């Protein structure tokens, strides 16, 4: 059933993804279809993620530790839109890996790093949520640490992403020109088999479990129920506000799992039964999921807008060059003081709370 590519070479038709078009694998139009999907994605992913990164940096008020983690996520998405999607697009219209083996490596490595980093960052977010809920004590926490933490996630991400570059597994996806870890063969010199189990479980699965677990602990504490006003089942507006953040974080995770999980499952199943067909082992299946994972890059900016008024209002401030932020503003801390932005609403040295300075702000 299999050749180096997913299709059988009953005919001599099969040709290397590096050398020629893969038109035999799927209809040519399907190639343009995937190319089309990528092109549109590039626009959305770039604009949305840039907006997120831009807005939080631009608006002084949105400086939360969580915001730091989100920039990290946004950054990971940006790399996808700039780095990975572009190559994936070129290939698609070419119908194969014009770039050749070196590039397959470059292209797989960066995209792999992006996926690993995302799930790992989501875990940090989960843990931080747990910490915020149980121990509101603000001082046990530092912005500086967050940067350190973010860097750490990247380091671990490299731990999986980089070793394939080290003599380890390698390869292109079903129709593909997307490159990923070598699930198909057990290229012995390469020691593929070991790498495969290790990577999925350690990088994707374990972090998924932790996020799930941390999620459960949060269940006892702040839950979905949150009354819009501070009053009612909320003990302080800040407490009531936080519940909003947690819910978005939950949705962010959910969307993440839905997008990626199918790929990871297919990752493993072919590992167990390579050279065979799953329900059907084909170009189409592997392809659909990996490209689907790419869509994730776009979803987070949408969730933010829908999910939180603060970003929504603050973003709008950014969109219209001037303030022009009608629509009711944040009606809370657009900024703590009032409106928030680089300028405009976010007044220098935003106000402080408590005789002492409760939040590390107004420093």
């Amino acid at each position: 059933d299999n050749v180096l590519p997913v299709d059988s070479d009953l005919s001599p038709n099969i040709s290397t993804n590096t050398s020629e078009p893969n038109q035999f694998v799927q209809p040519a139009w399907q190639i343009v279809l995937w190319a089309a999907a990528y092109t549109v994605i590039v626009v959305t992913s770039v604009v949305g993620n840039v907006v997120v990164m831009w807005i939080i940096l631009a608006h002084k008020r949105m400086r939360t530790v969580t915001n730091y983690f989100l920039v990290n996520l946004a950054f990971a998405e940006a790399s996808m839109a700039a780095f990975n999607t572009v190559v994936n697009f070129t290939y698609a219209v070419h119908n194969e890996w014009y770039y050749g083996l070196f590039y397959c490596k470059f292209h797989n490595f960066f995209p792999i790093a992006a996926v690993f980093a995302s799930i790992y960052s989501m875990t940090a977010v989960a843990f931080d949520r747990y910490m915020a809920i149980i121990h509101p004590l603000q001082p046990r926490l530092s912005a500086t640490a967050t940067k350190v933490v973010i860097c750490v996630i990247w380091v671990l991400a490299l731990l999986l992403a980089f070793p394939q570059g080290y003599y380890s597994t390698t390869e292109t996806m079903p129709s593909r020109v997307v490159c990923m870890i070598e699930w198909p063969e057990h290229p012995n010199k390469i020691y593929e088999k070991v790498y495969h189990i290790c990577v999925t479980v350690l990088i994707y699965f374990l972090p998924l479990l932790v996020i799930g677990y941390a999620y459960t602990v949060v269940g006892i504490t702040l839950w979905a129920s949150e009354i819009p006003g501070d009053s009612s089942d909320r003990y302080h507006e800040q407490v009531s506000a936080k519940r909003k953040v947690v819910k978005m974080m939950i949705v962010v995770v959910c969307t993440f799992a839905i997008c990626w999980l199918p790929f990871h499952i297919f990752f493993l199943l072919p590992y167990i039964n390579p050279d065979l067909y799953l329900k059907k082992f084909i170009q189409q299946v592997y392809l659909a999921i990996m490209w689907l994972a790419m869509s994730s890059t776009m979803y987070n900016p949408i969730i933010y807008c829908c999910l939180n008024d603060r970003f929504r209002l603050g973003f709008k401030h950014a969109f219209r060059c001037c303030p022009f932020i009608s629509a009711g503003d944040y009606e809370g801390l657009e900024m703590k003081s009032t409106r928030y932005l680089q300028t405009q609403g976010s007044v220098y040295k935003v106000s402080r709370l408590e005789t002492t300075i409760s939040t590390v702000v107004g420093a």
């Binding site: 050749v3 180096l4 070479d9 001599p12 099969i14 040709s15 290397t16 590096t18 050398s19 050749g100 083996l101 070196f102």
Partner: peptide, 11 residues
């Protein structure tokens, strides 16, 4: 079976 000619120049 893959063609050996591309072996020299896989790229």
């Amino acid at each position: 079976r893959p063609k050996p000619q591309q072996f020299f120049g896989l790229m």
